[PDB]
Structure formats: C-alpha cells, structure tokens
Design a protein around this ligand. Sequence first.
Ligand code: DCP
Ligand code: MG
Ligand code: MG
Ligand code: NA
Ligand code: NA
Length: 326
Amino acid sequence: TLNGGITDMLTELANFEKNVSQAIHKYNAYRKAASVIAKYPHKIKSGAEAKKLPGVGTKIAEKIDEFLATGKLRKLEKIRQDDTSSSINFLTRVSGIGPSAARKFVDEGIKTLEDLRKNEDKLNHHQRIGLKYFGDFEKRIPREEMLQMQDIVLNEVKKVDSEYIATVCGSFRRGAESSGDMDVLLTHPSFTSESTKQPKLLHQVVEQLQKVHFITDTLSKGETKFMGVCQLPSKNDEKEYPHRRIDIRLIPKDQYYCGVLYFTGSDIFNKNMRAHALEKGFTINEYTIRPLGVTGVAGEPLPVDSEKDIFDYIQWKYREPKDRSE
DNA sequence: CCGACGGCGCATCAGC
DNA sequence: GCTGATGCG
DNA sequence: GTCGG
Ligand SMILES: Nc1ccn([C@H]2C[C@H](O)[C@@H](COP(=O)(O)OP(=O)(O)OP(=O)(O)O)O2)c(=O)n1
Ligand SMILES: [Mg+2]
Ligand SMILES: [Mg+2]
Ligand code: NA
Ligand code: NA
C-alpha cells in the first residue's frame, strides 16, 4: 500500500480515458503502470525512480512528480470540476452502461441516479438490473460470504449431476480477503472440444440455482456464459444480504487448465501473460494455447495437462494464484 | 518514428 | 432470418 | 501512454 496515492491517481486517470476519452489503450497504459507500481516494494521518492519500471514512461513520470510535490494532479482536479465528465464517469458505474451509453444519456440530460430511475424505460435489460442493485453492486463480498456462496453453488451443482465440477475462480482463487463478485467455472464430462453430447448443460445449473432462490436475476445467458445476480439466504429476523453479481462459465472439460488460468486472472495478469506469449510466439485464450508461425496465424492447440504447462511453454516460472494478483 | 498493445461470449443493431 | 460490427463485461 | 525494433 506504499504508494496508494500514486496508484490511485493512475486509476482515476485510466477510468477517465476509458469512460470519457474512450481511449482504451491509454486506459490500459495507466492500468499497467498502476499495477507495476502497486507491487513495487519501495516507497517511490520521485518520478525518475518510477520511470525505471516498465510501463511508466515520461508522461507518467511528470505526473508522479507533480503528485509527490503538491499531493494532487491538476489535470485530475479539473476533470473532477467538469460537469459532463463527472456525469459520464458516474453512469458507467451502473452495470451494463459503458462509455458510449454514459455519453448518450448525458446528451439527453440524464446525469444522476434520479434521472436514471425516472427514465428506467430508456434502459436495456442488463442496465435495468444494474440500476436496481446499484448500491449492492458497489459493495465488496467478504471472503466468509464467498465461502457460504461456494457451498451452495457446489452442492446445488452436484444435485443436478454428480459429474459437474464447479470451481470458484477470480480473486477468490487468488486468496483475496474480499471479492467484487463470484466467478464460477463449470465442467461436465459430456461437453468437450470434441462434442456436445448433452444439451442445455449450463441451463440445467442455472435453473437449479434459480429454484433454490440463489440466483435472482439474469443479466445475460447463452450456452457457455451466464451472467446475473445471486443472494445468500438470511436468518429469521436477520437483515438481508446484498445482492451479488455472479458469472458462470462452462468450459470444455479437456480445456480446463486454459479455462482456469483465464478465469483465475486477474485481467491484468492475463494481459501481461498473453502479451508475453505473443512475444514468445504463442497465443493463449481461455481454451487453448497455440503457436503462431511465419504468417499471423494460430497453429494447432499444443497439449496441456496442468496450469504450469502453460507457463512452461512461454518460458515463465510458475506462479501461484495468490501471486497472479496484478 | 511506428505499429502493437489479450481475448472472447452475449445483446443489440444495421443492412440485406 | 442471416451476418457482421460494436458495446459491454 | 509506452514499448520494441
Ligand atoms: N477484461 C477482463 C476481465 C476479466 N478477466 C478475467 C480474469 C479474472 O480474474 C476473471 C473474473 O473477472 P472479474 O471481473 O470477477 O475480476 P476478478 O474476479 O479478478 O476481480 P473482482 O474481485 O473485482 O471480481 O475473468 C479478463 O481476463 N479480462
Ligand atoms: Mg470476481
Ligand atoms: Mg466477473
Ligand atoms: Na522499461
Ligand atoms: Na457500467
């Protein structure tokens, strides 16, 4: 937490580029710098020291320099004052509303939570449930609640079929003391890269979790990616738990290790690892790792039987989930 | 300087 | 109905 | 915005 003020400034910068400028690479630049400073185990005394790290360049060096002197970034000071940017930023915190929708709403005078509620019928479905549970989705989930939710999902999943395996991934598998949401990877032996012997494999799971009133809302749903809302049961007289985001991702069982690498994350660790795969001459997605040769074309999937095997290929010594928290 | 910067599922829309 | 591009997580 | 070539 040594440079919590620095990395925050970079995060506020990155959200602005994504949400206002819609400059997704500047946003990825700032989020990379942010991450590589967050794990740097000294208290950064100057911009020049920060620039030594990969991902901090000159622009970010001047800004760290300004921030260390005054305790602020004048560029950020004005971005806070700007009415329209402040509004676009705010509406993006609603699930299902990205930078384009946040700008389109602001050009209609829709700038606040009241305006959203008042104009609910101008929201698609995901954005309706996003706004419904706006405050809840702002809360983090203590790991203790993540452990309760895990019991339910896994025990309902094996009521459906003892052959399902469900693995909780995301920050939970990385050992986080609290989680933004719950991320569940699902495998059944019928669904492989070879064949879909069984239909509606994900639907059966979603149905059961709805029947026991765990899943309460759906943001989106197809054959391999469910995205909705869930809520722990509360005791008699207890106040209710907040509603929680839940994502469920069904992966061909023979492709489990590429799946659990992807879903365990983080997004940035994934991005560094896949970038460095390209530099090694490979591509990794959630399903496969493959070579690219001569052309710009993926070859055939290399064999994988462990998460480490993926690290071996790109010549990275293996890293525990709790060390993949970039 | 300049191209690359990770990758893909689902919802929605435009254009047939 | 499609397919393809774009928004969003 | 930053990197590699
Ligand atoms: N742009 C992204 C977003 C997500 N993921 C990945 C890796 C993640 O770890 C996982 C789950 O996504 P989350 O949004 O749940 O991210 P985390 O679980 O890691 O963090 P949080 O605790 O906020 O949920 O999918 C990715 O690869 N690229
Ligand atoms: Mg999560
Ligand atoms: Mg998620
Ligand atoms: Na560097
Ligand atoms: Na949003």
